[PDB]
Structures are given as structure tokens and as C-alpha cells.
Amino acid sequence: DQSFLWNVFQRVDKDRSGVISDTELQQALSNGTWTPFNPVTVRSIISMFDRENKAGVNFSEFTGVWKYITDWQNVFRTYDRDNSGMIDKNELKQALSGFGYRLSDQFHDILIRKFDRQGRGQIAFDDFIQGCIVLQRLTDIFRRYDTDQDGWIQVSYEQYLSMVF
Template structure:
């Protein structure tokens, strides 16, 4: 999918390009795609398949019936979602290396409305980059951005005074962390 432009679906149906991708990804012809099938179809900027966690996260986001798989309509939503993130990623991967460095990540997150410290940006890169190259691939970028968005939504629900701080119980914190991490 890397490099494929996204298109809207024809009224009342699935975009033919999306249907073609779905058919190619649905290797067992079950009519549904699981995380392993999705992983086999997605390649990051380093020529490697997307990580297990990225694929599981994306399937989970669009698996409305919690079956562990997505159908062609859910896949169409996922396809559009991935293409949106690819556009953002490419915007900040200025050297077209297939990776974004700390400064590029900081700019991307700032553009999304987040003002994180340089130390926090470094932490995000270190957490994502298991090979210590101080860069982030597109799948790692998607995972980090989705997790930040999920945590932000949950934080805002609890920050009823919009003060930028919350008081949270330990179990609530653990539930929040577990739900936002996958």
C-alpha cells in the first residue's frame, strides 16, 4: 500500500481499487482480513513488513464487531486511514529516506497541535526504534500517533476543567494505558 493514492468509494459501494487490494490481502479467501494477512501486505519505508503491533492496532481500530478481522467495508476505512497517515509521514520525511528523525517527528507532532519537549520526542523515538538508529519508520509513526491520539482523547475526557492536569486512580490509569496501547 505504501505509495498508493487513496480514493473515495463510489456512492454506496467499495472503491474498485480497494476491493482489488482487499482481494490480494485476503489470502485465505475468507472474506475477512486478520492482522497477519494485513502485515504481509504492508511494507514500511525500509522494505520490511509493518510490525505486529501496528497491524494489530489498525485491525482493532476498524474491527467493529470485535471478531479479530475486518471485512471489505472496514478495510476501505483502514485503507483511507493509512493513506492519510502516509501523506503526513511523507510531508515530514523531507529527505525521502523512508524514516523520520527526531526533528521531523517534532515538527509533525507540533503541526498536529502537540508541544512536546525534546526529551519526550527522544523517548518516543527510542521506544519505537529497536535498532537504535534514532529514526522512526512509517508503521512506528502510525502506532505512536494513534496512541498519542487515544491517550489525548482519554485525557480530555478526564480533564473536565480543561486545566491540563488530571487526578487519576491507579486502576483507571492502568485501564487507560492498556486500552490506548493496543
């Protein structure tokens, strides 16, 4: 039912639009730090929650375009130890391993780096959805080509360069 979500479209008409472009949602969600929500994280929710190849959602899926963030906030929250809204190295060693991951101490300090901008050694939330789902899959295409049962895959200089994208 769209009436349950009709007041959500009210805030989303700076240019009357009706269809949700990338920023057409940006003002409906916080990242946890007073900054805007990174569009790179946004298009992950639309091109993934819309069949139409133009990046703009609707009822058929917006029942869930949002729903995934309501999926994602529970986890985040049910891990925040400090409740300060950020996950640390000690903290991620528990969340990652909550997702059935057997990595090691040394990767449990390599991950944080791409996403911790401020440089305090913690992940905000706009850094979480994006890149979480990205990594949620680097166990997955790493899967499609070679299950060595120790992790090794490889191809030549040829279209293996094509794979890297």
C-alpha cells in the same frame, strides 16, 4: 465499489479465507525496511475499522481500513526532509507541532526511544501508525478525567490502578 478493490483480495488467500485475519493483510503493505508489518500495528486498523468483535474487515469499512494508511502516508511524506523514509528529532519537533502540540526539547528525545529499534535515532513507518494514534490519545484520556488547565490528574491505589490500562 469492491471492483476497485477486487485485485486486493487476490493476494489475500493463502488459506482461501476471504475475511482478513491479522496477517491476511500483512503482505499488502511495507514498513519501509524490508521486514514484515507488525501485527500489533495491524489490529489497530481492524478492531478500529470493524464493528464485528472478531478482528476481520469488509467493504463497509475497508474502503477506509486501508484509507487511513493513505491518510497517514501523505503526512509522513510531506515531512520527510531527507526523504530517506524516517523522521528525526529535529523533524518530529515540526510534525508533532504540526498537530498543535506544545511540548519541549527534552520530550522531543524521549519519544523516539520506544520505537527506534535499530538505534540510529529515527522512526520507521511500522513504528509510526501504531503509537502515533496511541499518543494521539494521551492528550485525550488525559482529557476525560481532569482538565486542570495545567496538566495534572490523579486517583488513589483503588481502581486508579484500573485506569492505568
